[PDB]
Amino acid sequence: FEVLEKWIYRGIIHDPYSEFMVEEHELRKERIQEDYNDKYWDQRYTIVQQQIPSFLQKMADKILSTGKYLNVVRECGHDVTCPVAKEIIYTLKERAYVEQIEKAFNYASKVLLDFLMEEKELVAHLRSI
Amino acid sequence: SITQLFDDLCEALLPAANRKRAKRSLKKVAYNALFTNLFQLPARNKILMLSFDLRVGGLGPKADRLEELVEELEAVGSVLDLLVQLAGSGPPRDYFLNNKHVGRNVPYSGYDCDDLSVFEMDVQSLISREECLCHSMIQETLQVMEAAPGTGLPTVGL
Amino acid sequence: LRRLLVWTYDPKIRLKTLAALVDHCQGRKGGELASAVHAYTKTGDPYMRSLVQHILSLVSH
Amino acid sequence: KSPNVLLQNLCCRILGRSEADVAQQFQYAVRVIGSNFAPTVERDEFLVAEKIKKELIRQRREADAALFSELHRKLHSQGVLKNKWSILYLLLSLSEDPRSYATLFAQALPRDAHST
Amino acid sequence: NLNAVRETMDVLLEISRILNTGLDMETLSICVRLCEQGINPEALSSVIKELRKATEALK
Known part of the structure; x- marks a missing residue:
């Protein structure tokens, strides 16, 4: 719960052991292009x-998507x-870290939505389609 | 409001097993002791002068709490003036004593066996009750099992 | 105190942390060794993380 | 007297104000002085005299450093004082020159090689 | 007003617990309400120790 102190409020992982629920990949490479995965749910x-x-299973997809949204704006x-x-360092018999995940998950979509509708706007691209 | 709470105080010092006249006699001795003494410097500073006396004999966090609470109680003083004189009329591990294994604190401390020796007293204080019980069940029953006949337990005195 | 077996259980973990860097950083020289003291502030034992978070503070002067 | 009221006598002596004026300072003083009532280091008055000598050499008065030996004699002559170390260390801590490296030279033993 | 003095009384319980007083809740309530009226509390500190002693002489 110190890897989550960076991954859910930003888009970086400083865990070098892969036993964390998220595992990092990069899809900004030379053999991987933008339309060669189409979704960064697939392989990133x-x-x-x-x-x-x-018990983090209750928020699990949102946990992935929170630091996932924030990184492609960064x-x-x-x-x-x-x-x-x-x-937090996982205080059991308190559900404070369902609430923190929910607040970060809303903020991630705020930042990604603002970035997506201002720069490389989805308004004009769909109009031109 | 004082006159109902002095009545409740006289209810508690009456043993509840008649018992409607004994309360008034306890009220007699209560007023008779109340007017005996009546016949014959800030508030918070009195707490500060004893928090120093707390700090000299160990126990830092208790003085740390005692000084912060009276700070927010001054941001009622007669109660603390009452308490500084009643502070000697009272009664006559977890996972943190010398935990140097877990934590984001630096493990860097030298030895003195006077943090661990008052961690051997933290166990011995449990054991010094739990050993006085083993002495005080056989003496307490050998002082009652042995007496003179006819005066050995007062239920034969009925 | 049980033939001093308490006193080999706050260190013998100090020593255990500092006998790993005595082989792992044995074979390095210069700034490539300060590429591998940063490997003990990511280790899971909260013991070793906080001992090396102090030594690397002195080393990064 | 008792030490706790003696702290209050101090806070009336140095300030021209009474205790009714300011009580934040007396609380902070209780935070400092408490749990420091016992010298956990060696109390050699000899080292403390040789530190006043270094202090008066640092202020360039060798005549004052050589009258200091007669005054250090007078304490030995009476001998009625109990901790000679504490009062001279106190007057040395409040040293002032009427007109750098000081931790690098001699200080009393820590007692980390002894049980405190 | 009764909401304020209740909260201050609840805070006054904990500091009379760590100062090792002879008080429980009932003598705390009577003596805090007595101090609210206002008399010299230095004499109340003697009358309380006398009241408990004079009840204890009967037992």
Whole structure:
């Protein structure tokens, strides 16, 4: 729960052991193109099913998508400005880290939606289609 | 409001097993002891002068709590003036004593066997009750099992 | 105190952390060794992470 | 007297104000002085005299450093004082020159090689 | 007003617990309400120790 202190409020993982629920890949490479995966749910950030602390399962897809949304704004911008610096080391018999995941998950979509509708806007691309 | 709580105080010092006249006699001795003494410097500073006396004999966090709470209680002083004089009329591990294994704190401390020796007293204080019980069940029953006949338990005195 | 077996259980973990860097960083020289003291502030034992988070503070001067 | 009221006598002596004026300072003083009532280091008055000598050499008065030996004699002559170390260390801590490296030279033993 | 003095009384319980007082909840309520009226509390500190002693002489 110190890897989540960076991955869910940003788009980076500083865990070098792969026993974390998210595992990192890059799809900004030379053999991987933009339309060679089509979805960055496929091969960039995936979720390991049996390496989950057995109750984070309730938020699991949102946990993936939260740091997943934030990174593709960072990669071609710098915009994070996170409003959740709350941190945890897994205090059991308290559900504070369902709430922190929910707040970060809403903020991630705020940043990605703002980036997507301002720069390389989906308004004009769909109009031109 | 004082006159109902002094009545409740006199209810508690009455043993509840008649018992409607004994309360008034306890009220007699209560007023008779109340007017005996009546016949014959800030508030918070009195807490500060004893928090120092707390700090000299160990127990840092208790003084740390005692000084912060009276700070927000001054941001009622007669109660603390009452408490500084009643502070000697009272009664006559978890996972953190010397935990140097887990934590994001630096393990860097030297030896003195006077943090661990008052961690041997943290166990011995449990054991010094749990050993006085083993002495005080056989003496307490050998002082009652052996007496003179007819005065050995007062239920034969009925 | 049980023939001093308590006193070989706060260190013998100090020593255990500092006998790993005595082989793992044995074979390095220069700034390539400060590519591998950063390997012990990511290790899972919260013991070793906080001992090396202090030594690397002195080393990065 | 008792030490706790003696702290209050201190806070009235140095300030021209009474205790009714400011009580934040007396609380912070309780935070400092408490759990420091016992010298956990060696109390050699000899080292403390040889530190006043280094201090008066650092202020370039050798005549004052040589009258200091007669005054250090007078403490030996009476001998009624109990901790000679504490009062001279206190007056040395509040040293002032009427007109760098100081931790690198002699200090009392820590007692980390002894049980405190 | 009764909401304020209740909260201050609840805070006053914990500090009379760590200062090792002879008080329980009932003598805390009577003596705090007595101090609210206002008399010298230095004499109340003697009358309380006398009241408990004079009840204890009967037992």
